[PDB]
Design a protein around this ligand. Structure first.
Ligand SMILES: Nc1nc2c(ncn2[C@@H]2O[C@H](COP(=O)(O)OP(=O)(O)NP(=O)(O)O)[C@@H](O)[C@H]2O)c(=O)[nH]1
Ligand SMILES: [Mg+2]
Lengths: 175, 143
């Protein structure tokens, strides 16, 4: 916590999506490189900070984690407006969470800035035998929207770093 | 488990900030003493060109120590907000595990209060990020 800041850009990111899809674990894996099997539902909101490097630019990411339960929708909606980028997370083993992605996209249109960047993430790719959302259908949806799409595992860390880097590069190009 | 490790890491890092701070304030104590010894010597109570070179370095050093102390104070503040947030969260999680039947009207009032303090601490952490950013923008504009 300096007086003279050694970063070039500050990007504010937001994680949204159904409860239990792994939003908090993705943040924990990215910001702290750890992982808990405990299901500790998020109370309203929280954020962590991680600094990254992109084309010679040092970029501070402020990443907001939100409760997915509908019950918290009023509380979490205040936080959409200031986001540079919003990541919508679903669970590849959970068909209904993918189904709800259309709803989460409408929450973004209602509450976020007009030009906010968006990224679609299917989490829990480690659960091989339990996967039910074909990445073909997810990818083809994302593409019809001009949205980038990635599958991740917060548990074994696959693609987690790449997900946030991809989001940051999209913002940088825009901003 | 996961929560204990996080607490341990937080505690070690507060402790280490505190250590650096303690050393800085000691060096500030010593530099101030050297400061009056130099004044006395220049005022006539070795070589005075040499004293002046010493006085010059003391001035630079007081500035260095000041900027170091101020950086550490901000870090310590940031860490206390995080520690405060964590205890609020655990206090709230515990109240919530209490089943609703035995839940007195004063319990509901305390949940609301703990929740309010938790969101305010989070808001203080966020405004600290926004303050740093403002400062970045100003320094860039000055230079
Ligand atoms: N196998 C596997 N389990 C995961 C993965 N990510 C999260 N989980 C598990 O799924 C559960 C939900 O985690 P969590 O991150 O809390 O979900 P959430 O989206 O934050 N929920 P909420 O919105 O209520 O706070 C936890 O038991 C967690 O360990 C993953 O990549 N693989
Ligand atoms: Mg969560």
């Amino acid at each position: 916590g300096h007086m003279n800041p050694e970063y070039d850009y500050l990007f504010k990111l937001l994680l949204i999506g159904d409860s239990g899809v792994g939003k908090s674990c993705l943040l924990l894996r990215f910001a702290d490189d750890t992982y808990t099997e405990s299901y500790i539902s998020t109370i309203g909101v929280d954020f962590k900070i991680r600094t990254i490097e992109l084309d010679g630019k040092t970029i501070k990411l402020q990443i907001w984690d939100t409760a997915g339960q509908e019950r918290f929708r009023t509380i979490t909606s205040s936080y959409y407006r200031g986001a540079h980028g919003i990541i919508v997370v679903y669970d590849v083993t959970d068909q209904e969470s993918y189904a709800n992605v259309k709803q989460w996209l409408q929450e973004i249109d209602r509450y976020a800035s007009e030009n906010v960047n968006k990224l679609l993430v299917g989490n829990k790719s480690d659960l091989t035998t339990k996967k039910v959302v074909d990445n073909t259908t997810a990818k083809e949806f994302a593409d019809s929207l001009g949205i980038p799409f990635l599958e991740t595992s917060a548990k074994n860390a696959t693609n987690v770093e790449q997900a946030f880097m991809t989001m940051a590069a999209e913002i940088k190009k825009r901003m | 488990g996961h929560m204990k490790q996080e607490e341990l890491k937080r505690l070690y890092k507060a402790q280490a900030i505190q250590r650096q701070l303690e050393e800085v304030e000691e060096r500030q104590r010593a530099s101030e003493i050297q400061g009056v010894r130099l004044e006395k010597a220049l005022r006539g109570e070795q070589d005075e060109a040499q004293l002046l070179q010493e006085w010059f370095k003391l001035v630079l050093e007081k500035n260095k120590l000041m900027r170091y102390e101020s950086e550490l104070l901000i870090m310590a503040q940031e860490l206390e907000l995080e520690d405060h947030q964590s205890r609020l969260e655990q206090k709230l999680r515990e109240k919530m595990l209490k089943e609703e039947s035995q839940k007195d009207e004063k319990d509901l009032n305390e949940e609301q209060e703990v929740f309010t303090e938790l969101m305010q601490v989070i808001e203080q952490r966020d405004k600290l990020v926004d303050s740093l950013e403002e400062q970045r923008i100003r320094e860039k504009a000055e230079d």
